[PDB]
Amino acid sequence: AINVGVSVSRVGGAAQIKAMKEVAGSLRLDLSQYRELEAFAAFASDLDAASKAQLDRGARLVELLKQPQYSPLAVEEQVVAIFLGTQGHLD
Amino acid sequence: TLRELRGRIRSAGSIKKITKAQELIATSRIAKAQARVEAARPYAAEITNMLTELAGASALDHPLLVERKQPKRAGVLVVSSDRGLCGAYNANVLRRAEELFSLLRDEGKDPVLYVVGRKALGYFSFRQRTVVESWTGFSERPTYENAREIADTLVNAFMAGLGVDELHIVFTEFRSMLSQTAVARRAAPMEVEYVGEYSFEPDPETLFDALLPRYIATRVYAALLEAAASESASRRRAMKSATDNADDLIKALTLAANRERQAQITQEISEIVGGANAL
């Protein structure tokens, strides 16, 4: 249950391998804005198609991030797992 | 300090009770409004049938059916609520109102404004555009007696062509309890809609000229009923949102007050024990 909004790494992307740094580096802010977009749209009777598409992308990214207990994924697999989502192949 | 937090907890609790009560009230009134809508429909449907079987015989030359040679000034009726707590209802209606005003002024016309509801009246009295006339005190439960006067005023404003070359209505259409929005309709001049496949007393032209204004009146009535139902549904949604917000506020205030209780007791005990350890 990582709170993507409050969580921070004050060293940042300095210790992140270039593959993950490129594939995932956009994910944090996209998920934060998805969370706020969801908090808004929870009571929107109607809203533009772009908001709805961003909302579905965010929901599918959130569903992507979770994983079961005692199931650590190697980085070589994590980069692909995040590629599936960030590049939109899950759409 | 703790006293402030306790008082705010009491206040938030009272607010939560009030908002839940009004939420259930709105849940009942949306059903009342839908009942009135479906009770009014069967008259409009028969008026539509009669008007079309008269139109088939009529000359189709009544002013309301023919466009002006060069329009300059368009009348617009904006329907809004008389009570607050509706949330986005008035906001949506008025943002669509201004979008329609910008469409008109892009085409080349200028709007003359009629307003139903005190909220839009306040909005257009803050933003300096002059309302021609307005009506208040029935947006919650419109009766035909009011739609009659509104339609009369708009039709007289049109037939004078001060006068207007067009009549629009801005309201909200109740698609379903969970989903609703504001809509713009041109009420005049009406387009004639030919589609493929009687005695008239004294003549068809007379009955048609007498009937079209009443069609305008019943249509504006139906629009006001849709507006009232949409208003009650948006009141439901917004009051549920307010109840949830008050619940979360009560939670946070209770947490803060319990932390203050613990800190106060700990500070008192530390003071007592420092006094003891001094002797």
Side-chain angles (χ1 to χ4, degrees), chain A residues 39 42-45, chain B residues 178-180 237 241 244:
Chain A
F43 290 149
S45 297
Chain B
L178 281 189
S179 314
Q180 66 208 119
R237 188 189 293 101
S241 196
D244 274 328

Side-chain angles (χ1 to χ4, degrees), chain A residues 8-45 47-50 53-76:
Chain A
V8 196
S9 163
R10 312 195 208 151
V11 164
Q16 205 172 34
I17 71 166
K18 202 158 194 162
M20 185 85 73
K21 186 154 58 195
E22 280 280 23
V23 180
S26 191
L27 183 55
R28 178 189 167 82
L29 307 175
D30 304 332
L31 279 170
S32 198
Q33 67 196 259
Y34 158 60
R35 203 73 70 170
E36 78 182 318
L37 173 77
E38 184 76 75
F40 165 68
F43 290 149
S45 297
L47 75 175
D48 59 18
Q54 188 173 43
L55 195 81
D56 187 65
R57 174 64 77 83
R60 285 181 281 98
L61 285 165
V62 168
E63 181 49 24
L64 167 68
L65 279 177
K66 65 187 69 158
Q67 60 177 61
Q69 190 184 22
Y70 310 145
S71 85
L73 296 173
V75 70
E76 69 199 61

Side-chain angles (χ1 to χ4, degrees), chain B residues 52-68 71-105 107-139 141-144 146-161 163-164 167-196 198-202 204 206-212:
Chain B
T52 56
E53 257 172 358
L54 272 161
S58 62
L60 300 164
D61 213 358
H62 189 78
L64 292 161
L65 308 186
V66 61
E67 300 81 2
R68 300 290 169 74
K72 290 175 287 183
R73 186 161 50 250
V76 59
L77 187 79
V78 173
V79 183
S80 300
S81 64
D82 303 0
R83 280 164 62 218
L85 311 168
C86 309
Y89 182 69
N90 311 135
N92 296 337
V93 165
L94 298 163
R95 293 155 63 231
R96 182 78 84 234
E98 182 279 356
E99 182 281 347
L100 182 72
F101 295 0
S102 278
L103 174 67
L104 269 45
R105 280 148 49 254
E107 191 73 341
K109 312 180 192 173
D110 52 2
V112 289
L113 170 66
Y114 310 82
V115 171
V116 183
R118 195 172 298 102
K119 286 292 218 83
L121 184 57
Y123 174 90
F124 289 118
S125 53
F126 179 83
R127 296 189 179 198
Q128 301 303 278
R129 68 169 71 261
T130 58
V131 299
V132 180
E133 198 153 39
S134 66
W135 306 264
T136 70
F138 56 69
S139 178
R141 183 200 165 80
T143 174
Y144 182 72
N146 316 134
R148 191 70 135 158
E149 297 211 330
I150 287 163
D152 262 9
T153 297
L154 293 172
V155 171
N156 277 263
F158 172 92
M159 224 64 61
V164 308
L167 296 171
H168 299 273
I169 183 164
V170 180
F171 72 114
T172 65
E173 211 175 330
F174 183 64
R175 316 200 180 292
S176 175
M177 177 276 291
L178 281 189
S179 314
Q180 66 208 119
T181 193
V183 184
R185 293 290 195 249
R186 197 180 76 202
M190 308 173 66
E191 280 196 291
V192 184
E193 186 172 306
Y194 297 107
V195 301
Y198 264 109
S199 302
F200 304 114
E201 286 290 4
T206 302
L207 259 56
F208 195 72
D209 275 27
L211 183 61
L212 273 167

